[PDB]
Design a protein around this ligand. Structure first.
Ligand SMILES: Nc1ncnc2c1ncn2[C@@H]1O[C@H](COP(=O)(O)OP(=O)(O)O)[C@@H](O)[C@H]1O
Ligand SMILES: Nc1ncnc2c1ncn2[C@@H]1O[C@H](COP(=O)(O)OP(=O)(O)O)[C@@H](O)[C@H]1O
Ligand SMILES: [Mg+2]
Ligand SMILES: [Mg+2]
Lengths: 388, 96, 322
């Protein structure tokens, strides 16, 4: 009952602290955001949580991944983190949560994978040490059976992998990734997919790509997650959208498992015949359109969506034009790369190069991020003056 | 919920339409969807339901498609619902 | 089960008295012994281990005595007499332990010669490993047997060094670890090369187009990366460098083979395909379905740029023809 008082108090703080506007349209905190927090406590399997104190640490994680970390700035995230800590202080006593809300805290994450990709998947706290090891290991299994991903792993990127792997764990749950240019999200989602066991799918962009060709792919995509009952991740970028009416079919898939004018009358009946074998196996003796209402529930469980929007252009308009894209999906805003990320990246790319000396080597890897950060500052200093 | 649900039911048994306003919260669709299941559970012969979400690119010609998808000639009286029973329609995102 | 425990204690006291008599005869035999002095020192060490156990048994006898007295006044006088017999045996043992200490000092010096021989045994195994990896030919499966026989000869040298260390009671142990890690790494290289050789043999029996170039490349590209992942002997040697060049030749061979399997040549009919064979200046065959083995021995690496020109012409020619 204390969690339910706590989650309510949190909703009342954020809705007051963050008001919706034409910019930051998403900041509107509806009920269904609160509903996604409690969906994360259900993912928690019993017996794996003996300690009471711990179940709170899971709820705290889940709040940040749910309707935290959808903020344009780092300054908003600082106010949001402060708002929780004080609500966590009042609600929960005899339980310390210092050093998980302080300045320079210890990263906390809850994924299905802890012991690794290979071992059994129980949803619980991952230690920060094994994070670097397991995401690295998980890449090597992807660098086997798939095309070489060629990504550099920095603390913030590993966070983004785990964050997506949560968002695509529950049945109805869908992902929406907001990144500036080369943020990570498109390939990070291809990694996330493989860690979950879901095979990634992406529509092939063509000059002669029609409505009927999309509709044909959506049927085959349903067939993979419907009777065959295989988990299929669906990656969709702004580049992949040539026509606005393609994004219609998508918004229906996010709203509910049922899509209008996807299946014909014959194909629907032909699919119900295949499902009829399954429901007899499940032990629910129904030979009616209840079987079809089971199919779309099974499809929406084994079909997740990872949509990849740029912030600056063609989002505010599409968000206003389709409510599903921003409402139904759990969004995770990508901030710019931190100084700690850039330094790790620069050192990997420059590793093959000589760079003369060993002191020089140390200074040249130091320069790359220092040069990027002060140009980014001057870019905002310039913007203020001349509007460049 | 219990108050509002009771009314919408009693309204659909007098063939008087309703309309559900909300700030994208308090489960307008799910309350409505829940009610339509409760009515269908009671009388599966008399009343059937079909939920049609409204996209930004839904015209008159498209809507005619969904109406024509579940209809009959019904031996005179022009278009009639299948089974000779009263089909409930539903409409979501009527605003857009 | 306390009076029964006192009876079992009395039987254990009689067994220790006979065990003491046996330990005295074992002490005199080692005295008669001192090769032969080293074997006497080993028997002296086992007797010194038996003596400390007897010194503990004598104290346990005296306690089993005092337990009887308070429980059996006579049984207290029996195990007190047993402790008295144990002290007299411990006195004769200290005299034998002094003579044993003189021989143990001579044994400890010989132990250093056993440790030096172990170091020479370790260096030879390091050199032989350099000669095993080379042995060039298709005795790669057989060299595993020659490696394993070497690992058994090293493992026999380890058990001999572990026996020599027990007699005396770091560096010899580190050398054993280093050989075991070298053997493990060598075996991993032999297993990988055998898998890569099997994949090359499987590809070699394909149809003219069953390989499909890109499908061949992906497995090698995966195999070539997963080759560099293993870190045994820091590559180099000969047999290793040769197969990485063979793989690289094989890797560079497929894009050229992909152009020979491209639809513009698959069309055939015209003499544009026969002109491709005239650059090679060798005996060639045209099969819709046949082994890629002949393609690899056809020397497609030779006249590379000449072929690459005819492939581009053939493609342009098909596109217009279509
Ligand atoms: N050569 C490359 N340069 C940059 N990123 C690359 C490269 N090759 C692959 N990637 C992957 O592309 C991902 C995202 O790049 P991009 O699609 O441009 O950004 P976004 O997904 O934000 O639109 C990164 O996570 C990275 O792993
Ligand atoms: N008692 C409830 N009955 C039904 N849905 C509920 C209830 N409590 C919470 N919900 C949740 O409310 C969410 C809000 O959906 P809703 O406001 O109808 O969306 P929209 O306004 O965008 O159509 C639903 O996803 C549902 O899970
Ligand atoms: Mg990008
Ligand atoms: Mg709703």
């Amino acid at each position: 009952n204390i969690i339910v008082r706590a989650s309510l108090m949190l909703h009342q703080a954020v809705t007051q602290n963050f008001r919706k506007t034409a910019i930051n349209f998403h900041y509107e905190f509806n009920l269904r955001h609160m509903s996604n927090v409690f969906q994360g406590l259900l993912l928690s399997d019993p017996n794996k949580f003996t300690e009471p104190d711990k179940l709170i640490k899971l709820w705290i994680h889940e709040c940040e991944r749910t309707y935290g970390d959808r903020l344009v700035s780092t300054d908003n995230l600082k106010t949001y983190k402060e708002n929780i800590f004080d609500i966590v202080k009042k609600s929960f006593s005899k339980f310390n949560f210092s050093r998980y809300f302080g300045n320079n805290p210890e990263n906390l994450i809850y994924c299905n994978f802890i012991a690794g990709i290979n071992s059994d998947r129980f949803y619980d706290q991952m230690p920060n040490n094994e994070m670097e090891k397991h995401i690295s290991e998980a890449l090597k299994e992807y660098n086997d059976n798939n095309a070489f991903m060629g990504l550099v792993l920095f603390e913030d990127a590993m966070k983004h992998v785990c964050r997506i792997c949560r968002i695509v764990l529950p049945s109805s749950g869908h992902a929406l990734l907001v990144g500036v240019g080369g943020s990570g999200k498109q390939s990070l989602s291809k990694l996330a997919s493989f860690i979950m066991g879901y095979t990634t799918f992406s529509i092939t962009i063509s000059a002669t790509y029609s409505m009927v060709d999309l509709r044909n792919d959506l049927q085959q995509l349903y067939f993979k997650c419907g009777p065959k009952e295989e988990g299929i991740l669906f990656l969709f970028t702004e580049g992949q959208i040539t026509n606005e009416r393609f994004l219609v079919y998508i918004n229906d898939l996010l709203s509910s498992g049922e899509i209008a004018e996807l299946y014909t009358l014959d194909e629907k009946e032909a699919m119900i015949n295949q499902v009829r074998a399954k429901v007899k196996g499940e032990g629910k003796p129904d030979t009616r359109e209840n079987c079809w209402n089971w199919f779309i529930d099974q499809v929406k469980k084994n079909l997740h969506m990872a949509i990849c929007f740029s912030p600056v252009g063609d989002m505010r308009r599409r968000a206003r034009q389709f409510p599903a894209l921003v409402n139904c999906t759990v969004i995770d805003w990508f901030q710019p790369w931190p100084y700690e990320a850039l330094f790790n990246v620069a050192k990997s790319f420059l590793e093959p190069v000589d760079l003369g000396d060993d002191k020089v080597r140390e200074a040249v890897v130091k320069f790359m991020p220092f040069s990027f950060t002060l140009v980014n500052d001057l870019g905002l200093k310039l913007l203020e003056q001349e509007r460049r | 919920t219990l108050a509002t649900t009771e009314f919408i039911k009693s309204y659909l048994m007098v063939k008087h339409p309703s309309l559900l306003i909300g700030n994208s919260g308090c489960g307008k669709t799910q309350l409505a969807k829940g009610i339509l299941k409760e009515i269908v559970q009671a009388k599966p012969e008399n009343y059937a339901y079909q939920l049609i979400n409204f996209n930004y690119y839904t015209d008159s010609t498209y809507l005619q498609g969904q109406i024509e998808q579940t209809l009959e000639k019904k031996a005179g009286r022009q278009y009639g619902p299948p089974g000779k029973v009263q089909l409930i329609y539903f409409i979501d995102d009527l605003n857009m | 089960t306390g009076s029964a425990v006192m009876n079992y204690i009395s039987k254990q006291l009689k067994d220790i008295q006979e065990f003491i008599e046996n330990t005295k005869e074992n002490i005199e035999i080692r005295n008669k012994n001192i090769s032969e002095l080293i074997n006497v020192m080993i028997n002296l060490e086992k007797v010194r281990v038996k003596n400390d156990d007897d010194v503990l048994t004598l104290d346990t006898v005296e306690e089993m005595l005092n337990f009887l007295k308070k429980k059996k006044d006579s049984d207290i006088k029996k195990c007190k007499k047993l402790q008295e017999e144990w002290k007299n045996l411990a006195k004769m043992a200290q005299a034998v332990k002094k003579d044993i200490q003189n021989p143990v000092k001579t044994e400890s010096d010989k132990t250093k010669e056993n440790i030096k021989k172990f170091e020479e045994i370790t260096l030879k195994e390091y050199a032989n490993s350099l000669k095993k990896e080379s042995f060039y030919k298709t005795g790669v499966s057989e060299s595993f047997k020659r490696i394993g026989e070497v690992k058994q000869k090293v493992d026999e040298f380890e058990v001999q060094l572990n026996q020599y260390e027990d007699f005396a009671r770091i560096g010899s142990k580190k050398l054993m670890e280093q050989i075991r890690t070298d053997v493990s790494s060598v075996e991993k290289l032999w297993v990988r090369i055998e898998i890569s050789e099997k994949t090359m043999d499987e590809y070699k029996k394909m149809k003219w187009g069953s390989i499909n170039s890109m499908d061949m490349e992906d497995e090698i590209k995966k195999l070539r990366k997963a080759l560099t992942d293993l870190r045994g002997i820091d590559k180099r040697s000969n047999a290793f460098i040769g197969i990485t060049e063979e793989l690289k030749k094989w890797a560079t061979f497929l894009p050229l083979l992909g152009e020979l399997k491209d639809p513009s040549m698959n069309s055939e009919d015209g003499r544009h395909w026969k002109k491709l064979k005239d650059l090679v200046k060798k005996e060639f065959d045209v099969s819709q379905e046949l082994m890629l083995e002949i393609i690899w021995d056809l020397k497609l690496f030779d006249y590379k740029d000449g072929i690459e020109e005819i492939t581009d012409q053939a493609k342009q020619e098909l596109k217009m023809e279509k």
